[PDB]
Amino acid sequence: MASRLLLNNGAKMPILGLGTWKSPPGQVTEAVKVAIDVGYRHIDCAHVYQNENEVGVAIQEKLREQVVKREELFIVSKLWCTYHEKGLVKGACQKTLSDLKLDYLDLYLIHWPTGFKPGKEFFPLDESGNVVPSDTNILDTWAAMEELVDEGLVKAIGISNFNHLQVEMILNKPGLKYKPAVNQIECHPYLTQEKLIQYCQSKGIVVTAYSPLGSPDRPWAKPEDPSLLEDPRIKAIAAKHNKTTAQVLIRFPMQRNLVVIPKSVTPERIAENFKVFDFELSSQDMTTLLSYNRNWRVCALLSCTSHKDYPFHEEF
Ligand SMILES: NC(=O)c1ccc[n+]([C@@H]2O[C@H](COP(=O)([O-])OP(=O)(O)OC[C@H]3O[C@@H](n4cnc5c(N)ncnc54)[C@H](OP(=O)(O)O)[C@@H]3O)[C@@H](O)[C@H]2O)c1
Numbered sequence: 001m002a003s004r005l006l007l008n009n010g011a012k013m014p015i016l017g018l019g020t021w022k023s024p025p026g027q028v029t030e031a032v033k034v035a036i037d038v039g040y041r042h043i044d045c046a047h048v049y050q051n052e053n054e055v056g057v058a059i060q061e062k063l064r065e066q067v068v069k070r071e072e073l074f075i076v077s078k079l080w081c082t083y084h085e086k087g088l089v090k091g092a093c094q095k096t097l098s099d100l101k102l103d104y105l106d107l108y109l110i111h112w113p114t115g116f117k118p119g120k121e122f123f124p125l126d127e128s129g130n131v132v133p134s135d136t137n138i139l140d141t142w143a144a145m146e147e148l149v150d151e152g153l154v155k156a157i158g159i160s161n162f163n164h165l166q167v168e169m170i171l172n173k174p175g176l177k178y179k180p181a182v183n184q185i186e187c188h189p190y191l192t193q194e195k196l197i198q199y200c201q202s203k204g205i206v207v208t209a210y211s212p213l214g215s216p217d218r219p220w221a222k223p224e225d226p227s228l229l230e231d232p233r234i235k236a237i238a239a240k241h242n243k244t245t246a247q248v249l250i251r252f253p254m255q256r257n258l259v260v261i262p263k264s265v266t267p268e269r270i271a272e273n274f275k276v277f278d279f280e281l282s283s284q285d286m287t288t289l290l291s292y293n294r295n296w297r298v299c300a301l302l303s304c305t306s307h308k309d310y311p312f313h314e315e316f
Pocket residue numbers: 018019020021022044045111160161184185209210211212213214215216217218229244246247261262263264265266269270272273299
């Protein structure tokens with residue numbers, strides 16, 4: 001097992017990163033500092049997580065402490081849906097850079113394929129509970145992303161929650177300058193993404209697996225919901241390797257050649273989640289974990305099912 005994957009921009013991306021969605025501003029600074037100390041060199045961020053300033057403080061302090069050099073870190077952020085208009089893309093990126101206190105991002109993703117009405121609401125909704133869309137399309141937004149590479153603001157650009165037809169649309173864009181480097185998608189044993197992964201990987205697009213532990217702190221979690229961390233089949237596999245269930249769930253996408261980004265603000269867990277390079281899941285473990293697929297999504301973007309670019313109508 002190698003620790004980094006080669007992207008189609010020629011850069012290498014650490015296969016393990018720290019997630020920061022739901023990491024409070026008052027805890028994420030310590031969380032990122034601890035991650036850096038124990039060996040994480042990839043942090044997954046987003047404007048919409050409302051904590052990029054506090055992530056940037058942690059990064060800046062570790063650089064000042066000479067713990068790590070900038071070129072050794074791989075920092076990822078994401079363009080929010082209200083900024084899909086070509087004229088707003090650069091300014092959204094610069095705002096993220098200012099918050100993170102960085103000169104450049106290693107990777108900037110379109111967070112969702114769906115553009116939302118521009119303004120001061122992350123999620124403009126109407127009386128039907130549906131999102132107010134913007135007059136944008138993914139190809140024009142992609143063109144604006146491409147300019148950020150030429151302007152040196154980001155080293156790589158990519159997409160998130162795009163289905164394979166949406167990836168194909170970009171790959172066939174008239175005037176395409178840069179292929180997406182990464183498609184970041186939800187992936188875990190209840191949503192195995194076999195076709196979308198095979199598709200992206202066949203195109204040289206690296207897949208990042210999000211919510212690998214099943215996002216147990218997701219704000220919409222219900223007692224009747226399944227739980228990967230408490231799944232007794234997965235506990236059994238973990239017991240066999242003398243590892244925790246979290247460690248199995250993190251190692252699982254790694255062996256499929258995916259990048260994986262488990263989130264924690266707990267120092268012991270941040271350390272524990274990193275201890276995944278000292279064992280291997282067997283071929284049958286992998287086949288068994290894949291058999292648990294139920295196409296069960298934590299992030300289904302249910303407020304946008306009528307948006308023209310809603311990604312989860314298609315099979316994959
Ligand atoms: N592109 C997108 O649209 C998108 C969507 C969702 C997520 N993401 C990214 O993916 C990252 C990870 O996904 P996620 O935050 O949804 O959930 P996740 O990483 O699957 O799970 C996070 C939850 O698991 C807990 N946890 C972490 N390590 C644990 C361990 N060793 N044992 C027991 N519990 C543990 C955390 O608790 P504590 O924090 O309290 O320790 C937190 O409650 C996000 O933070 C974000 O960066 C991206």
